[PDB]
Design a protein around this ligand. Structure first.
Ligand SMILES: CCc1ccc(NS(=O)(=O)c2ccc(F)cc2)c(C(=O)O)c1C
Ligand SMILES: [Mn+2]
Ligand SMILES: [Mn+2]
Length: 369
């Protein structure tokens, strides 16, 4: 009925009523004519529309509470000296128990990202990686939980040297600025500019050098779909703006990345992230190993991202060639680590928000961030 010191009680059994805690509920940002959004807070039409998709919002909440309790636990023990593998496996072991992993009904939405320093995202260790977290490392812990495909994409940055404090704040503030600015009928490009003005209004000093924080321009937030980490709409972070507005009922992952490098990422290091193309249909495979591996992917991950380690834990061996095949066949897409120029530092803060009819909910919000 109460969580245990080292979290072990599933969020499930903590809220027996089946109703999970809501995130930070915000009133939608006004528009031109000071168009207030307090009319939706209790409109009759909207309230019916909201309570209409209540079971969904409730699932996002179960996952969010899982994310909150897991990360609270990670910040209490993540320390330099631990290998990236020890960290990810310890984090993922907790994440599996609190979300009560159940096939594709409940589990980890994507691999535990823990990109270091100049690398901003999509780095998680593969078997054999001997990398050890250092006192001067700036590590982005980015992991996700999901219930019935309702994905909670949320992340924070970890450091131990106070010299990055102002860099993390610059980015944490940039993220909240995009969260506050986001809303139904809000144009993506606008959320982007907002995020940039703030991000760039910060200047930091790290090891004698001064820098004006730069948003990683080729990185960004994005909309979320059931069992689909990236639904289709992207959230800028800079000045351009695709050509779109956020819509009622949508779900977005508002994330920003700040850097001292060139503010641009590129594929680097060995790949560990892979995900089945949400669009590709059923492809008959006769090649044994490739056929088997794909079956494992469909059974265990569906359209959710996974990593080599997760193939390992399932007892799969000698699967790289077969994984390459799936990749060359375009059935699976590789998602290599995205890093900025060597020597640069990058920070990241991310939250999942629900654009509900009556309000904007920052479901993954917590005491920490
Ligand atoms: C590796 C699976 C994956 C695919 C697409 C996106 N979304 S994205 O393409 O908008 C993206 C890519 C890199 C990044 F750093 C942020 C967002 C993400 C993600 O939300 O990070 C993941 C984990
Ligand atoms: Mn993320
Ligand atoms: Mn994301």
């Amino acid at each position: 009925k109460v969580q245990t010191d080292p979290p072990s009680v599933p969020i499930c059994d903590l809220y027996p009523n089946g109703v999970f805690p809501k995130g930070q509920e915000c009133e939608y940002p006004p528009t031109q004519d000071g168009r207030t959004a307090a009319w939706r807070t209790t409109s009759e039409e909207k309230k019916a529309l909201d309570q209409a998709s209540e079971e969904i919002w409730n699932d996002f909440r179960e996952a969010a509470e899982a994310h909150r309790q897991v990360r609270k636990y990670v910040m209490s023990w993540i320390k330099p000296g631990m290998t990236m593998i020890e960290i990810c496996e310890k984090l993922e072991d907790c994440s599996r128990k609190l979300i009560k992993e159940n096939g594709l009904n409940a589990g980890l939405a994507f691999p535990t990202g823990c990109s270091l320093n100049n690398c901003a995202a999509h780095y998680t260790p593969n078997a054999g990686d001997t990398t050890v977290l250092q006192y001067d490392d700036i590590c982005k812990i980015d992991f996700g939980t999901h219930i019935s495909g309702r994905i909670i994409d949320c992340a924070f940055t970890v450091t131990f040297n106070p010299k990055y404090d102002t860099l993390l704040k610059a980015v944490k503030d940039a993220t909240n600025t995009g969260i506050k600015c986001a809303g139904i009928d809000v144009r993506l490009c606008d959320v982007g500019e907002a995020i940039q003005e703030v991000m760039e209004s910060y200047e930091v000093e790290i090891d004698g050098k001064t820098y004006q924080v730069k948003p990683i321009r080729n990185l960004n937030g994005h909309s979320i779909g059931q069992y689909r980490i990236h639904a289709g709409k992207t959230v800028p972070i800079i000045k351009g703006g695709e050509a779109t507005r956020m819509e009622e009922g949508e779900v977005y992952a508002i994330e920003t990345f700040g850097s001292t490098g060139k503010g641009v990422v590129h594929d680097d290091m060995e790949c560990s992230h892979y995900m089945k193309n949400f669009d590709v249909g059923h492809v008959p495979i006769r090649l044994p190993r490739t056929k088997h591996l794909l079956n494992v992917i469909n059974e265990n991950f569906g359209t959710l991202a996974f990593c080599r380690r997760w193939l390992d834990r399932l007892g799969e061996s000698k699967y790289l060639m077969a994984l390459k095949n799936l990749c060359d066949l375009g059935i699976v897409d590789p998602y290599p680590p995205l890093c900025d120029i060597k020597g640069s530092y990058t920070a990241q803060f991310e939250h999942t928000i629900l654009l509900r009819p009556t309000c904007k909910e920052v479901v993954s919000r917590g005491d920490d961030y």
